[PDB]
Structures are given as C-alpha cells and as structure tokens.
Amino acid sequence: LHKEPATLIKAIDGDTAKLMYKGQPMTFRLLLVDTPEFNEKYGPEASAFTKKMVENAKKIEVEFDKGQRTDKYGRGLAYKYADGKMVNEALVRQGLAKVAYVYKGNNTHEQLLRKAEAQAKKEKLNIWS
Numbered sequence: 480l481h482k483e484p485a486t487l488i489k490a491i492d493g494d495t496a497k498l499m500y501k502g503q504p505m506t507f508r509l510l511l512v513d514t515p516e517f518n519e520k521y522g523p524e525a526s527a528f529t530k531k532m533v534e535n536a537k538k539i540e541v542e543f544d545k546g547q548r549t550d551k552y553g554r555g556l557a558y559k560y561a562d563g564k565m566v567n568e569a570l571v572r573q574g575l576a577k578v579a580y581v582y583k584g585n586n587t588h589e590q591l592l593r594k595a596e597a598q599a600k601k602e603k604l605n606i607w608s
C-alpha cells in the first residue's frame with residue numbers, strides 16, 4: 480500500500496471527514512473501524528479526537544487498500560495518516576472505535592488494529608470502561 484496526499488476540508492465525526500484528494504472534495508470513511516455516532520455514548524469524544532488529530536496535522540495522507548476504494552455512498556475508503564500516525568489505529572487504541580467492517584480484500588491493517596483494540600480493552604478505556 481501507498482500513502483497519497485490529501486488536505487482537510489472539514490472534520491465531520493469520529494470516522495469520516497471531508498478531504499480534498501486529487502483536487503476534488505470527497506467524504507472519506509476510515510477503513511476497518513466504527514466510531515459511535517455523535518448522538519451515542521463516546522460519539523462526541525470520538526468526533527473530537529479525530530477532529531484534533533486531523534486539524535492539528537501538518538500533513539494528511541490517505542492510503543487505499545487493495546480492494547474497493549469507494550463505498551456505496553461514494554465515500555472514499557482509506558487509512559488516514561496525520562503527520563505519519565494512523566488515525567484509524569489511534570482511535571482503536573484509545574477505545575473510541577471498535578474494529579469493524581472487515582471485508583475480505585480490504586483488510587491489510589486488520590491485525591495491527593486488533594492488537595490496538597486488545598490493548599484498549601485491557602486498559603478498560605472509554606468504550607471498554
């Protein structure tokens with residue numbers, strides 16, 4: 480997999496944001512995770528976590544997996560990096576997302592994320608508290 484450039488247009492919630500990619504605006508949905516909705520418990524905390532990470536980054540990058548690059552809603556499906564740190568992983572490590580939506584052929588980072596989830600759960604963080 481390869482990292483590609485994008486710029487933040489606006490934060491949306493814990494697992495989506497509007498980015499400019501190849502010069503076009505797109506909503507991106509993080510691969511392999513599920514954050515609570517803003518109206519759910521830990522929703523506002525997930526939204527704030529991703530917002531800070533993406534708004535504070537000097538450099539945002541998107542990394543597509545080997546399979547589908549857009550979902551049925553026209554959202555980009557990617558691993559997102561903020562100054563080299565993967566947002567998807569960071570959310571899971573903090574207990575603010577669960578590993579989820581692991582479709583075959585788009586699951587390169589599954590084991591990395593499951594290890595983070597196991598650590599979050601061991602620490603009883605947030606969703607696991």
Ligand SMILES: Cc1cn([C@H]2C[C@H](OP(=O)(O)O)[C@@H](COP(=O)(O)O)O2)c(=O)[nH]c1=O
Nearest residue numbers: 494508509510511512513550551556580582
């Ligand atoms: C994360 C992801 C979600 N989706 C679709 C599945 C779910 O369809 P349904 O909308 O029919 O439930 C929806 C979940 O996204 P959200 O968690 O953003 O709602 O997005 C994919 O198709 N591929 C993916 O990799």
Ligand SMILES: [Ca+2]
Nearest residue numbers: 494513514515
């Ligand atoms: Ca969600």
